């Protein structure tokens with residue numbers, strides 16, 4: 261390989277890092293919200309100056325490769341939990357939060373962030389503005405919500421709250437300043453995305469280059485790396501597909517982010533070569549035969 | 552409803568499958584340690600505890 | 601024209617060989633990709 | 649606030665599907681290759697429950713939503729104009745409605761006060777749509793989407809069914825995948841025999857335990873025009 | 885037929901996340917992707933043998 265053909269879409273707007281991670285109001289766990297993210301230059305370097313994350317651990321992708329990759333269908337959830345309930349936000353966990361409020365899928369391609377907010381979400385008296393469910397029938401399916409407020413009974417019959425075996429399913433988080441690390445507010449933001457499957461409009465700051473054709477080059481198309489020869493194609497791509505595949509799993513056709521135009525990818529090496537030698541003892545000359 | 556566990560992590564079984572499985576020969580130990588010595592209770596660790 | 605007799609030509613005509621041309625150049629496997637020739641797919645993976 | 653006093657028993661006629669109802673699995677271009685996939689598909693030659701209007705049968709009932717449904721509607725006139733998806737269909741559980749009211753397309757999801765009898769009134773005198781009532785309040789909201797403007801012909805047609813529009817709905821991981829497809833057809837019965845591939849059209853990010861579904865019908869005033877829609881359940 | 889089968893056997897996940905490389909190497913770092921690369925190498929070597 262000789263050159264680089266890094267090519268990224270036409271994104272010129274910084275991602276919203278103040279609307280999220282710096283929202284004035286954050287929802288409760290039992291009623292969380294979702295936001296769609298698109299047309300972003302995802303550079304988390306801007307968060308180095310303002311926010312410090314106590315726990316930043318996530319799955320499906322390497323942390324160091326977040327600057328070169330390109331994600332699609334990015335969504336951000338947000339809620340507030342206590343210190344001891346911040347470990348329940350993870351694939352394959354049990355607890356009040358992970359069963360009746362917010363359950364993560366077993367397979368998960370995304371990133372989870374959380375930081376401590378005591379100076380904002382606590383007072384000398386009780387806060388009592390954040391609620392969570394502790395009584396429910398069954399368990400929630402991954403990425404689902406339940407905002408209904410109806411009296412709960414073990415038998416299941418509808419009943420009035422003063423009756424026996426009849427409680428309200430929502431309790432109040434009591435946040436005080438004079439509390440330990442546990443029972444302290446923790447704002448949690450969960451990001452989920454899919455990469456290298458669908459056309460993307462959001463990823464980090466990688467400077468695109470010009471197109472090099474009919475030459476062994478190291479291309480980078482929306483995070484997809486590799487070495488090959490780019491050639492004009494004739495295939496017609498439907499507006500909902502970006503990559504192509506062969507009878508053996510390998511990308512042969514990639515739509516150009518900029519200048520949509522379908523390009524063919526072929527291996528650089530091709531052919532065969534044999535060496536004919538009279539014998540090392542006799543001479544060191546050889547004859548090469550290319551098939 | 553009553554107790555909140557700061558650390559609930561364990562081995563040999565999945566947490567989500569604890570409602571369907573049936574265990575035998577169950578024993579419970581109990582002691583009190585400090586904050587820095589709570590990480591030493593795990594298979595393959597070194598320390599005073 | 602051929603150096604074979606009539607019977608040998610008939611025998612050679614019956615067998616439908618895969619016709620490995622023994623010279624499949626890079627130009628042939630880089631163009632006309634819509635045909636999806638099996639041989640061009642094998643030589644790309646080091647099978648000759 | 650509206651209801652129907654005159655009632656007609658549902659037909660609930662069962663028919664067969666001629667190996668139709670497939671959709672594109674993933675967003676990857678593949679040509680000249682036979683691909684084997686394993687997902688929730690409509691079984692070949694399976695029962696389909698048909699509901700028919702214009703025979704004094706304004707059905708609009710609730711249909712269970714188990715592992716997704718295959719909605720194929722044949723109609724020469726726009727009588728079916730959307731659906732409503734919910735768990736209990738009351739104002740105690742969130743429900744998502746999709747209505748094809750003219751000049752846009754509306755998707756909204758909120759704690760809706762269902763009127764127990766969805767309505768869409770248009771008079772045949774001037775072929776003009778007049779306001780109707782599907783719900784009475786909205787309460788808590790969590791989605792919203794308004795599409796671009798278009799006008800669909802409300803003029804009644806005397807001919808047989810002219811177009812077939814089939815959809816596939818599936819709820820997985822909090823996403824409601826919608827696939828759409830359309831093909832011309834000229835017949836008056838059962839479901840046209842043939843083959844058609846459904847393309848992805850929507851992926852709605854709403855977290856709802858979708859278990860019941862109900863269609864939205866259009867009535868020409870008690871009584872309406874001819875329109876039949878088939879419901880087929882998918883299985884792994 | 886043997887050569888065609890060997891060609892079409894290149895799209896099998898031998899216990900890895902994906903059957904196509906330059907995808908494992910693009911989403912995972914050096915240490916994590918090595919396991920999947922070794923799995924793919926083992927499977928393809930078995931096919932060749």
Ligand SMILES: *[C@@H]1O[C@H](CO)[C@@H](O[C@@H]2O[C@H](CO)[C@@H](O[C@@H]3O[C@H](CO)[C@@H](O)[C@H](O[C@H]4O[C@H](CO)[C@@H](O)[C@H](O)[C@@H]4O)[C@@H]3O)[C@H](O)[C@H]2NC(C)=O)[C@H](O)[C@H]1NC(C)=O
Pocket residue numbers: 397398399400401406414415416735857858859
């Ligand atoms: C989304 O909505 C769905 C659909 O409504 C809902 O799933 C289940 O709905 C069904 C139908 O209402 C309920 O299943 C049964 O309901 C009755 C009333 O309680 C009873 O037959 C059963 O309850 C008893 O079951 C056992 C006795 O055999 C005992 O455990 C006990 O006595 C129970 O009372 C049975 O539940 C059902 O209530 C719900 N589901 C659950 C988990 O309760 C579902 O809740 C919603 N889905 C999600 C993912 O949130």
Ligand SMILES: *[C@@H]1O[C@H](CO)[C@@H](O[C@@H]2O[C@H](CO)[C@@H](O[C@@H]3O[C@H](CO)[C@@H](O)[C@H](O)[C@@H]3O)[C@H](O)[C@H]2NC(C)=O)[C@H](O)[C@H]1NC(C)=O
Pocket residue numbers: 291407787788789
């Ligand atoms: C879903 O809708 C329900 C019903 O409207 C919401 O519950 C109601 O929320 C309001 C505030 O939006 C509450 O009013 C306030 O409540 C307390 C005193 O109870 C106090 O802060 C104020 O004086 C004010 O009255 C209201 O009480 C509450 N309940 C009812 C029965 O109306 C609920 O918040 C909504 N959920 C979401 C997630 O939006």
Ligand SMILES: *[C@@H]1O[C@H](CO)[C@@H](O[C@@H]2O[C@H](CO)[C@@H](O)[C@H](O)[C@H]2NC(C)=O)[C@H](O)[C@H]1NC(C)=O
Pocket residue numbers: 270517518519520
């Ligand atoms: C992304 O931006 C590039 C900037 O070059 C666009 O390429 C230009 O497109 C215009 C028409 O929009 C042409 O007149 C120019 O000749 C193009 N310039 C080059 C250097 O190719 C490209 O079209 C944009 N892509 C999208 C999808 O908006």
Ligand SMILES: *[C@@H]1O[C@H](CO)[C@@H](O[C@@H]2O[C@H](CO)[C@@H](O)[C@H](O)[C@H]2NC(C)=O)[C@H](O)[C@H]1NC(C)=O
Pocket residue numbers: 662663664695696
């Ligand atoms: C719908 O499927 C049901 C399955 O029960 C069919 O109803 C009966 O099926 C049994 C079992 O094969 C037959 O012995 C009966 O004769 C069926 N009843 C009738 C009235 O046909 C039903 O036929 C299917 N609907 C179709 C094929 O349209």
Ligand SMILES: *[C@@H]1O[C@H](CO)[C@@H](O[C@@H]2O[C@H](CO)[C@@H](O)[C@H](O)[C@H]2NC(C)=O)[C@H](O)[C@H]1NC(C)=O
Pocket residue numbers: 739761785
């Ligand atoms: C949910 O819907 C029910 C049923 O329509 C509403 O119940 C009504 O309550 C009002 C007083 O708030 C009564 O005057 C009506 O007669 C009731 N309607 C019926 C049909 O019984 C209930 O209020 C709704 N909940 C809301 C809007 O929060």
Ligand SMILES: *[C@@H]1O[C@H](CO)[C@@H](O[C@@H]2O[C@H](CO)[C@@H](O)[C@H](O)[C@H]2NC(C)=O)[C@H](O)[C@H]1NC(C)=O
Pocket residue numbers: 749750751752754794
């Ligand atoms: C179809 O639904 C849309 C969305 O609700 C309606 O368009 C809105 O109409 C209201 C009337 O008060 C306006 O305030 C909004 O600005 C409109 N939204 C737009 C233009 O995006 C539309 O009127 C409905 N069609 C009918 C009732 O015939």
Ligand SMILES: CCCCC/C=C\C/C=C\CCCCCCCC(=O)O
Pocket residue numbers: 354355356554555556559569574577579
């Ligand atoms: C003392 C009886 C022991 C019985 C042993 C058999 C099963 C026990 C398994 C689990 C019990 C504790 C589960 C953890 C609860 C977590 C609650 C939270 O994280 O908030």
Ligand SMILES: CCCCC/C=C\C/C=C\CCCCCCCC(=O)O
Pocket residue numbers: 597598599
């Ligand atoms: C400065 C000399 C370094 C020598 C390096 C060679 C070996 C060192 C290995 C371990 C030293 C520290 C062990 C940790 C002690 C834990 C005590 C506790 O957890 O309570």
Ligand SMILES: *[C@@H]1O[C@H](CO)[C@@H](O)[C@H](O)[C@H]1NC(C)=O
Pocket residue numbers: 278282310
């Ligand atoms: C973030 O929030 C702080 C207060 O917590 C505010 O002072 C600051 O301006 C915000 N930064 C942004 C919006 O970039």
Ligand SMILES: *[C@@H]1O[C@H](CO)[C@@H](O)[C@H](O)[C@H]1NC(C)=O
Pocket residue numbers: 309
């Ligand atoms: C970074 O934070 C400092 C204060 O710590 C502030 O003066 C400076 O303007 C900030 N820079 C940016 C680029 O936000």
Ligand SMILES: *[C@@H]1O[C@H](CO)[C@@H](O)[C@H](O)[C@H]1NC(C)=O
Pocket residue numbers: 552
């Ligand atoms: C749960 O705890 C609440 C107080 O938080 C108490 O009123 C209630 O009785 C408890 N319920 C059970 C079943 O222990």
Ligand SMILES: *[C@@H]1O[C@H](CO)[C@@H](O)[C@H](O)[C@H]1NC(C)=O
Pocket residue numbers: 771773774776
């Ligand atoms: C058509 O008839 C309707 C219903 O009476 C009326 O509202 C409308 O003004 C008439 N004219 C047009 C041009 O729609």
